[PDB]
Amino acid sequence: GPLGSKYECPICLMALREAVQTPCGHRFCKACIIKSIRDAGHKCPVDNEILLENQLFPDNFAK
Ligand SMILES: [Zn+2]
Ligand SMILES: [Zn+2]
Protein backbone atom coordinates (compact mmCIF):
# COMPACT_ATOMS: atom_id res chain seq x y z
CA GLY A 1 0.00 0.00 0.00
CA PRO A 2 1.53 3.35 1.10
CA LEU A 3 5.27 3.56 0.58
CA GLY A 4 7.28 4.63 3.61
CA SER A 5 8.10 2.14 6.32
CA LYS A 6 8.49 3.22 9.94
CA TYR A 7 9.97 0.39 12.04
CA GLU A 8 8.62 -2.34 9.84
CA CYS A 9 9.54 -5.89 9.07
CA PRO A 10 10.49 -6.01 5.34
CA ILE A 11 10.09 -9.77 5.47
CA CYS A 12 6.30 -9.63 5.82
CA LEU A 13 5.80 -5.89 5.25
CA MET A 14 3.89 -5.88 8.55
CA ALA A 15 4.33 -3.97 11.80
CA LEU A 16 6.91 -5.47 14.13
CA ARG A 17 5.52 -8.35 16.17
CA GLU A 18 7.29 -8.54 19.58
CA ALA A 19 10.12 -6.58 17.87
CA VAL A 20 13.37 -8.49 18.12
CA GLN A 21 16.41 -6.34 17.67
CA THR A 22 19.41 -7.78 15.93
CA PRO A 23 23.04 -6.87 16.88
CA CYS A 24 22.92 -5.23 13.46
CA GLY A 25 20.50 -2.73 14.98
CA HIS A 26 17.58 -3.80 12.84
CA ARG A 27 14.33 -4.84 14.47
CA PHE A 28 12.21 -7.62 12.98
CA CYS A 29 9.18 -9.64 14.00
CA LYS A 30 9.97 -12.44 16.43
CA ALA A 31 8.94 -15.06 13.87
CA CYS A 32 9.67 -13.55 10.47
CA ILE A 33 13.38 -13.14 11.12
CA ILE A 34 13.63 -16.66 12.58
CA LYS A 35 11.87 -18.17 9.57
CA SER A 36 14.27 -16.30 7.33
CA ILE A 37 17.50 -17.27 9.10
CA ARG A 38 16.94 -20.93 9.88
CA ASP A 39 15.30 -21.53 6.52
CA ALA A 40 17.37 -19.66 3.93
CA GLY A 41 20.46 -18.58 5.79
CA HIS A 42 21.55 -16.78 8.91
CA LYS A 43 21.42 -13.19 7.71
CA CYS A 44 19.26 -10.11 7.95
CA PRO A 45 17.62 -9.77 4.48
CA VAL A 46 18.06 -5.98 4.29
CA ASP A 47 21.86 -5.79 4.49
CA ASN A 48 22.98 -9.45 4.82
CA GLU A 49 24.60 -9.31 8.24
CA ILE A 50 25.00 -12.65 9.98
CA LEU A 51 22.07 -13.11 12.32
CA LEU A 52 21.63 -15.92 14.83
CA GLU A 53 18.48 -16.78 16.83
CA ASN A 54 20.32 -16.43 20.14
CA GLN A 55 21.61 -13.02 19.04
CA LEU A 56 18.03 -11.77 18.83
CA PHE A 57 16.78 -9.79 21.78
CA PRO A 58 13.17 -8.58 22.12
CA ASP A 59 13.03 -4.81 22.20
CA ASN A 60 12.04 -3.22 25.43
CA PHE A 61 9.27 -0.83 24.57
CA ALA A 62 8.40 -0.39 28.22
CA LYS A 63 10.85 2.50 28.49
ZN1 LIG B 1 7.45 -9.59 10.19
ZN1 LIG C 1 21.40 -5.78 8.95
Curated annotation (Swiss-Prot):
What, per the annotation, is the impact of changing residue 61 to A? Loss of TRAF6 homodimerization and partially impaired polyubiquitin synthesis. Loss of TRAF6 homodimerization and impaired polyubiquitin synthesis
Tissues in which the protein is found: Expressed in heart, brain, placenta, lung, liver, skeletal muscle, kidney and pancreas.
What is the name of the gene encoding this protein?
TRAF6
Residues of the whole record sequence present = 67 to 124 of 522
The region annotated as signal peptide is none
Designated name of the protein: TNF receptor-associated factor 6
Zinc finger (RING-type) in chain? 9-48
UniProt comment concerning the protein's domains: The coiled coil domain mediates homo- and hetero-oligomerization. The MATH/TRAF domain binds to receptor cytoplasmic domains.
Please describe, based on the UniProt annotation, the reported consequence of changing residue 63 to R: Loss of SUMO1-modification and c-myb-mediated transcriptional repressive activation. Loss of TRAF3IP2-mediated 'Lys-63'-linked polyubiquitination
Per UniProt, subcellular location reads as:
Cytoplasm; Cytoplasm, Cell cortex; Nucleus; Lipid droplet
